[PDB]
Structure formats: C-alpha cells, structure tokens
Amino acid sequence: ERKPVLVASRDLPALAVIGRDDLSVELLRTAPVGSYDRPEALLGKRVWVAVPAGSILSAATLEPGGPLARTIRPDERAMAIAVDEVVGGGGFVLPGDYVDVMLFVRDERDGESTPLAQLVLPGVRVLTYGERIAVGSDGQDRSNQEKDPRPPRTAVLAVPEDGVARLMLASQAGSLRLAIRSKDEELYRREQESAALSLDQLLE
Amino acid sequence: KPVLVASRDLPALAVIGRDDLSVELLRTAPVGSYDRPEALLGKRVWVAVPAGSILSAATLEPGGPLARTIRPDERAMAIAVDEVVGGGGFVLPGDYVDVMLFVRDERDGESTPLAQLVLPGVRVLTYGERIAVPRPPRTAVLAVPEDGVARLMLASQAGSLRLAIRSKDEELYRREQESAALSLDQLLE
Amino acid sequence: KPVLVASRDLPALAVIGRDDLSVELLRTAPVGSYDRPEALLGKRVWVAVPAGSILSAATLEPGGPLARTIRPDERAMAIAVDEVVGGGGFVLPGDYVDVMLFVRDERDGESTPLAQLVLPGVRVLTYGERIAVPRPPRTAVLAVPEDGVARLMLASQAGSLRLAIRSKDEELYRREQESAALSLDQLLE
C-alpha cells in the first residue's frame, strides 16, 4: 500500500558520491518510475547533476549529462551567442521565447564595400538568458540564483543541426540582433506535438 | 512538511483538478513545492508529469512579456536611444513615432549626405525600464511590421536614427484595433 | 619513536605482507615514515627497496588523475574557454560536445571567412576546477581520439573555437561502453 522511496537529506553538489548520510527513506502512496527502494542500490554511485534537498532520487540523475543537455532533443544543439541590451530586446527576453536572428555585415568581395542585412535563423527557442534556464521534461529548474545581479552577457539557443555552422559565421562576420515573435502563434504548443537588402534598395 | 504530489499521470497542457493532486507529509520540503491544494487549482502544467512526482517548476509559463504585446504579423525589436534621438526624454510607451535616417552614401567615390523616412507610425512598446503589459534610458523597443525588420537593422547600423512623435488626435490606436531622399543639393540651392 | 623498516630485499612492483616489514624504535622519526604495520599492508612499492631501509615515498603511486579517465586509443588535451565558448557556464563534466571553428583563410591574396565542424561527440573530462575521476573558469580538458589531436591544435590556434552541446537522449555514453565548409557567399544569397 504505502511504498518506500529514497530521497536526499541534504544538498548534494554536482559530481558527488553518495554515502549513507546523504540518503533518507520516506513512505508514500505512489512510487515514481525510476525511484529506488533500498539504500544499498545507491551507495557508491555518482550524481552527475546537483540534487536539491528533499528531491526524490531518480535513475536519470545517475547518468552522464548536464543542465543544458537535459532540455533539448536529439535533432538539436545548444550554442551560445554574445548579447547586450540592444541585441536582447532591452533585457526583456526570457527562456521559452521564440526569436528571429538578423545579421548585419559589410561585404568586401569585389574591391568595394557594401552594407547588408539578412535573416539567417527563423523561429528559434531561447534556452538561457543570463543566469536563467528553461525547464525540461524532468520538471526541475536549475537557474543559478545569486546575489549582486550583474547585467546579462550571454544567451543560449536551441539550433537545428543544419544551422549550427550558419550561426557561427553570423556571430563573427558581423553584428547580430534578435526579433521576438508573438505568443499567439503558439509555436510552443506546435513543437510539443531571405533575400538580402542593400543600401541602394533602401535609399530610393 | 506538507507537499503536493501528482496522483495520476498528467499529460502536457492539462488543467488541474482536485482529483489530480494529493498531499504527503515529508521531513524536508524542496524549493518550489506548494503546501495547500488550492494554490495549484486551475493552473496548467506545461510538461508531462509522471505519477507520484513532487509538483514544482512544471506549473511555470514559458515566455516573456514582450511576446504578449504584439500580433502574429509583427515583431519586437530594440534600437539605441539618447535624449536627442527620442523626444527629449518625453517619449512614453503607447506612442507612435516615425523613424528618420541620416547616412552618407559613399558610392562612385564621392560622399553625399542624405535624409529619408524609413518607417512611419511605429508603436513604442518599451522606453528604458518602462513597459505596459535615476539612470538615463539606453534602448527602446518598437513593434515593427514583419517586412520592415531588415530595413530597420540596416538603417540602425548604417547611419544615424531619429524619432518624430505623431499627434494623439490622429487616432492611430483605433485604426490598429479596427517620398524620395533629400540631399544637400536640394536644401542649399 | 616507532618507525617501519624493510626486512628483506623487496623487488619492484611487489605487494607488502607482514613478513617483509619490521619495527624499530628511533629517536627521530623522518618525515614520510609510517608508525604501524597495518598502514602499509596491501600497498605496493614502485621502486626497489633494499634491506634495512626506512620505508617512505616508495609506496606512492606515480601518476595523475587525468590518465585514469581515458582509454589507450584516446588522449587528453586542454582548450581555452570563456562563457561564450562553453555554453554560458552550464557545461559540466560528462557532457558530449561538438567543436566548431571560425577561420579567416588567406590563400590567393583575398581573405574568406569560413566555418566548419572539426570534432563531433567529444567527452568533457574537466571544466575549470571540476573533475570526475569563486573564480571564472579558464580551461576545459577534452578526451580526443588519437587521430584528431593535431586537428584540434591547428583549430585552436588558426582561429576561434566554439562548443555545441548534444542531447542526453542520444545515449552516447552507452555507445562508448559498446562536411563542406560554409562561406559568406552561401549565407548571403
């Protein structure tokens, strides 16, 4: 009726080895899939991600992976770009948003310089903005809560495999900016189931 | 000590009733846990929650505020602002502005100043640290039509931008909720 | 006072029993000496110890931690990282990464920026001050295949490097336990 489930009695850091002092036993009505019944099954194993106090010990916590790798899919990658207030919508971008990446470059191919602007990546989910991170299928938030809030300097995006190179070029060949997309498009729900413009065309 | 637990499997994008939740007494309560059942009644889970799991961080809406103030045919983008650029520090969110550009052409080996209007009637979504649904402002976020994002990027990076404020008596919010380039030759002579 | 000495000639790479040891009481005990016989039972001497010698520092493993985390067909190399390179400080040891390179290649008298994937699926052994055998991180150690070592070195010095994290659902750790470059012309078209 009331099954035993093992939980953490203290704040286990990342890359820690479990002893008998860290574990505790509790009696519940339902045992989650992935839980353990006796302390001897978990002794000597390594937790590969931080476990807050009181958390139910799970099998997936004892496998190689990081906070970023637990919030993506096998057909995506996670890469970071340098951001400021102008690039990131005045500091109003939070994880879960969908953005378009715009590039400004000054080509120097045929002995002459030409400013240009293009759209490189449409509809990209934002995983981290600053010290805040998204929530994966595990239902756990792993945002670094620290005092003295410094302005954000980096953001991590979920990029398809074919575009990881295209972003990298755009990050170093010129300047980047982010354009936010509307919430009424429901790109989040749907995922749970261009010609370059020159100054000659702009100036009449 | 009290902690909420999922009694059955809750699928993605599902509302919460009293049958779904249970209360269990644990020695330590994790960060993010909820005590009374009424605190999670009517809310929606955004990831799948297997049975018996402690409920936390799955009831938080993914997204930001800027995405809640535009329409599917618009985008939100930010530009750099100073006191000269935006209305002497008298521009507030909820206004309508025209974007003007000054650039030096640099074609055919002769430089030529120019001035031109790039985007008319754009709605201001944020002025510095001010949003609607003692430090000088540094940026402003506007709601651009989907065909004008590249134009604004090119204008912002190629030259200098200024904002011209439009009148309140034009009723540009009701209509929402239903040329050429001047050169120094034309000005001087 | 009590000090442990050897009773017979102990050859290299030999385990220690109760017959090989003796206890002698000396006025001064040198640094590195062991007081009780059970402190050295089961340990191994890594250099030859002649008879009557005071036992110290011959019972210490020669080696470091990194060499215990790789296989005969792999090597360990360090690369320089910042927050942009290493995913905003959310990369831990045990993760798998792809290495991407940006270089400005010059063979014709004209410079052409390029981007390319150098190494796919590389385990991360150490992130700064973190190992599985404050101050911002500066280096990260990777387990490279033996044929790719040189390929990393060039990429580390000829241009800029970035890391792309792979998903946990791919299950590359269980697997371990048993293209063309893109130029600015392709992007701007």
Numbering used by the authors:
A (entry chain B): 54 to 246, 258 to 268
B (entry chain C), C (entry chain A): 56 to 188, 202 to 246, 258 to 268
What do the authors say?
The Tad (Tight adherence) pilus is a bacterial appendage implicated in virulence, cell-cell aggregation, and biofilm formation. Our analyses reveal that RcpC forms a dodecameric periplasmic complex, anchored to the inner membrane by a transmembrane helix, and interacting with the outer membrane secretin RcpA. Collectively, these data demonstrate that RcpC forms the Tad pilus alignment complex, which provides a conduit across the periplasm for the Tad pilus filament to access the extracellular milieu. A structural model of RcpC, combined with transmembrane domain analysis of its primary sequence, predicted that RcpC is comprised of an N-terminal TM helix, followed by two folded domains (D1 and D2) and a C-terminal β-hairpin that localize in the periplasm.
Further processing of the dataset, including imposing 6-fold symmetry, yielded a 2.5 Å resolution Coulomb potential map of the RcpCΔN dodecamer. Using this map, we were able to build an atomic model of RcpC33-303 containing twelve copies of RcpC. From this model, we determined that the RcpC dodecamer has a diameter of ~15 nm, and possesses a ~5 nm pore at its centre. Remarkably, the Tad pilus filament has previously been reported to have a diameter of ~4.5 nm, indicating that it is could transit through the RcpC pore. Interestingly, the D1 domains are arranged into six dimers, whereby each domain only interacts with one other D1 domain, whereas the D2 domains are structured as a dodecameric ring with C12 symmetry. Accordingly, RcpC adopts two distinct conformations in this structure, which differ in the relative position between D1 and D2, explaining why the overall symmetry of the complex is C6. Although present within the sample, there is no density for the C-terminal β-hairpin domain, which we could not resolve in spite of extensive 3D classification and masking strategies. The overall structure of RcpC demonstrates that individual subunits are twisted around the central pore with the D1 domain of each subunit primarily forming contacts with the D2 domain of the neighboring RcpC subunit. Additionally, L3 forms molecular contacts with the D2 domain of the adjacent RcpC molecule. These interactions lead to a very extensive interface between RcpC subunits, measuring ~2400 Å2 within dimers and ~1930 Å2 between dimers, which collectively are comprised of four distinct interfaces.
